[PDB]
């Protein structure tokens, strides 16, 4: 029995350098293989091709980087949707239908401020990177859309260095106020888009400053009877308001994006602002339950909108202030799984690592957790397992569990709850989960698992992963095989010898710079079958430290935080290698509290990993699903059954 495995990305990206891996097994001496991308209507036309040599010196594994040139694609509007991936050699010929996307670059629109007043000039530049996170000198078109949906300006600029500086957009003297949209796009080749937002608000001179200070940013069971609110008001700078009238109206809000709200006409009224500070207490129960919902269970994830108007008594001036929403919280904790694929491997202990966070998404320690579970076998015969209990580790927030299941189990319906000593049964956190068994026709299963689930996997170190299969035909497996993916491209591949005398074996992996944002590891072995060879696979998600290829560091001499106006100061910029640097100096007061908004600088780590075509923590229902969830299509003579019509990844 001789097998071949062709690994490619789930989708081909026009203009991208797509790396195609070939790993053959059972073949001796040396032989050659041709990898090719052809047109879906005609396999006569060749978008690109590469020759790879396979030998014992090569361990019968090689790699080839292919590129679908944009200029080869026709230039009528109706885009190409499928291509042919083809491998031809002396021994075999297999082809496959591949979808393509014209999304290939990334467009980050950086405006200096997110909020503007009339007559100001908006400074805007665009960072444009290709799929391989490289400068890519492509010309870019910016469009400006006003709050009424009118395209009011369009300007294109050539890109020289990967940073594209555009002329400043002058806000009119009396402009249209509201939320403006900027849309970035490429002029010729790709369909990639970028989008940013900025509000234009009219400046109004305030008589005084009004501040509202709640006891907490969330409302738990302890403050459901009393919620302290401190309302301050002061003139410009250090000066403070002597005497005033404070009027407070309260409302219930569904979400902060929608400006709709449900008032509570039982509001507090006529308190005294004395020497700058006033205080009130809000009885949540009384104010809601006559005018709205009966219970606090129906108040979970809704918000409490607060509006305050302060009318100073001496001069009669009026100023308004508002708190958009204080989220009602039913349980002080929220649960989420960490590094636990929702798939069962029959015969292998199934691990569950729960993680506890508070309303500010911070890891809470010392929290006891109770785990219950139901099991369903192939005969639909349910079995209720014995409950287990752990306590949350205070170094990472994790509460670990191990479950020993019968070999015949197929579905595991397990439910997790917190058991805090000071929480009522209603105020506890509860989450349910389901794990389905991996399906194999030879009763052959593979389970990989990465014991270092708390270290960041620092680049330069080594990844000691344990590959444990449980199956028959164990002592006829020759090797293990691996593919390492990051940012939607296969960066590594290889093979490790399987020891015929052990059950488990440690696989060592040097962690490289290609793996720095995120990585995915796919491990598989080939079980030989009389009728046909079978691929048994599993996958895991590797979270790796966010480290720059050319680390930038900016410093100010002098270094104290307090400076004087007009002070001559020096800025020191240092990079690992020669790099362009886009600088900005923004008044931090423009950000403050943000409602439904993300900082454009910290927006980059999340917008970059949309190119990871994988989802979840790993695993799959079968071999094809394991490959699919890692963002991979595969070609094999071992397995005939492939994923049909799976045009896009999850």
């Amino acid at each position: 029995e001789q097998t071949y495995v062709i690994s490619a990305p789930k989708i081909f990206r026009v203009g991208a350098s797509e790396n195609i891996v070939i790993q053959v097994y059972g073949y001796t001496e040396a032989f050659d293989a041709t990898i090719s991308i052809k047109s879906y209507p005609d396999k006569k036309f060749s978008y690109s091709s590469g020759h790879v040599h396979l030998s014992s010196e090569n361990k019968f594994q090689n790699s080839a980087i292919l590129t679908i040139q944009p200029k080869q694609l026709p230039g009528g509007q109706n885009p190409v949707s499928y291509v042919y991936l083809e491998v031809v050699s002396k021994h075999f010929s297999k082809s496959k239908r591949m979808p393509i996307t014209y999304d290939n670059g990334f467009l980050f629109i950086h405006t200096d401020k997110p909020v503007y007043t009339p007559d100001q000039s908006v400074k805007v530049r665009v960072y444009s990177l290709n799929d391989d996170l490289k400068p890519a000198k492509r010309e870019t078109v910016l469009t400006f859309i006003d709050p009424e949906g009118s395209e009011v300006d369009m300007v294109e600029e050539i890109d020289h260095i990967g940073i594209i500086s555009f002329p400043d957009f002058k806000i009119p003297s009396n402009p249209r106020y509201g939320m403006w949209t900027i849309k970035a796009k490429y002029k010729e080749d790709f369909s990639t888009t970028g989008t940013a937002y900025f509000e234009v608000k009219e400046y109004v001179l305030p008589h005084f400053s009004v501040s509202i200070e709640p006891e907490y940013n969330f409302i738990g069971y302890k403050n459901f009877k009393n919620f302290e609110i401190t309302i301050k008001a002061r003139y410009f700078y250090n000066k403070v308001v002597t005497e005033a009238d404070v009027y407070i109206t309260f409302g219930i809000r569904e979400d902060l994006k929608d400006d709709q709200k449900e008032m509570m006409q039982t509001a507090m009224q006529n308190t005294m602002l004395i020497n700058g500070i006033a205080q009130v207490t809000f009885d949540s129960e009384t104010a809601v339950k006559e005018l709205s919902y009966y219970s606090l269970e129906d108040l979970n994830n809704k918000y409490l909108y607060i509006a305050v108007t302060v009318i100073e008594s001496t001069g009669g001036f009026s100023e308004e202030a508002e708190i958009p929403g204080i989220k009602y919280v039913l349980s002080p904790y929220k649960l989420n799984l960490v590094a636990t694929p929702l798939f069962l491997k029959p015969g292998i202990p199934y691990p569950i690592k729960v993680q506890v966070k508070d309303s500010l998404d911070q890891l809470v320690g010392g929290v006891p957790v109770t785990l219950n579970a139901q099991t369903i076998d192939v005969n639909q015969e349910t079995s209720d397992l014995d409950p287990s209990k752990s306590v949350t580790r205070v170094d990472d927030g994790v509460a670990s569990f191990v479950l020993n299941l019968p070999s015949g189990v197929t579905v595991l319906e397990f439910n997790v709850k917190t058991d805090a000593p000071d929480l009522p049964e209603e105020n506890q956190a509860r989450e349910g989960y389901r794990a389905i068994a991996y399906s194999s026709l030879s009763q052959s299963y593979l389970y990989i698992d990465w014991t270092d689930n708390h270290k960041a996997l620092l680049v330069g170190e080594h990844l000691n992963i344990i590959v444990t299969p449980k199956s028959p035909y164990i002592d006829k497996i020759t090797h293990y095989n691996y593919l390492i993916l990051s940012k939607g491209k296969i960066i590594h591949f290889g093979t490790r010898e399987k020891f015929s005398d052990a059950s488990y074996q440690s696989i060592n992996i040097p962690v490289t710079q290609n793996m720095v944002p995120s990585s995915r590891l796919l491990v598989y072995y080939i079980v030989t079958g009389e009728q046909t060879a079978e691929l048994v696979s599993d996958s895991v998600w590797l979270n790796i430290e966010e480290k720059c290829g050319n680390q930038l560091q900016v410093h100010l001499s002098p270094d104290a935080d307090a400076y004087s106006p007009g002070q001559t100061v020096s800025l020191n910029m240092a990079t690992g290698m020669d790099s362009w640097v886009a600088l900005a100096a923004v008044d931090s007061a423009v950000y403050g509290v943000q409602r439904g908004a993300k900082k454009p600088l910290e927006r980059v780590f999340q917008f970059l990993e949309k190119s990871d075509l994988g989802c979840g923590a790993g695993g799959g229902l079968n071999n094809a699903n394991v490959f699919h969830l890692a963002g991979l299509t595969f070609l094999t003579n071992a397995n005939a059954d492939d994923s049909q019509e799976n045009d896009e990844p999850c």
């Epitope: 202990p349 287990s388 191990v402 020993n404 698992d449 014991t451 270092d452 270290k455 000691n464 488990y504």
Partner: nanobody
Framework: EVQLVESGGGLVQPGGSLRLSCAAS????????MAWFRQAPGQEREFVAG????????LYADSVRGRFTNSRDNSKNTLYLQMNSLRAEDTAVYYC???????????????????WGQGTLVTV
């Protein structure tokens, strides 16, 4: 809090057989993760052998695999390491170490471990 006491270490001929015992104080071991490590003088500490969960997983270093056998008597709350075919490379102080939590696999990393015995010397 966990206190840990190793015993059984001694002088042995190359080729000899020695059993190390790890006592846990203040915990019943349960399904927690526990391991053996070694440190030679002037060298960084290295994993030797481990057993995650209770008895269903068990991991050894490649240096010692096939020579050393790790076992647990749950009733006694003791860990045992049988050591056969010992060589001069096995001379080291041996430390029992344990983790907090129900981990199926043994971590090979000294940074993973929080409680440490005082150690026992093995001279081959």
């Amino acid at each position: 809090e966990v206190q840990l006491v190793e015993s059984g270490g001694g002088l042995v001929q190359p080729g000899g057989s020695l059993r190390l015992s790890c006592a846990a104080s203040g915990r019943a071991f349960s399904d927690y993760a526990m391991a053996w490590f070694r440190q030679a003088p002037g060298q960084e500490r290295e994993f030797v052998a481990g057993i995650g969960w209770s008895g269903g997983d068990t991991l050894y270093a490649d240096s010692v695999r096939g020579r050393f056998t790790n076992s647990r008597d749950n009733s006694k709350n003791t860990l045992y390491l049988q050591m056969n075919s010992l060589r001069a490379e096995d001379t080291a102080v041996y430390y029992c170490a344990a983790r907090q939590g129900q981990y199926i696999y043994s971590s090979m990393r000294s940074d993973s471990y929080d409680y440490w015995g005082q150690g026992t010397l093995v001279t081959v």
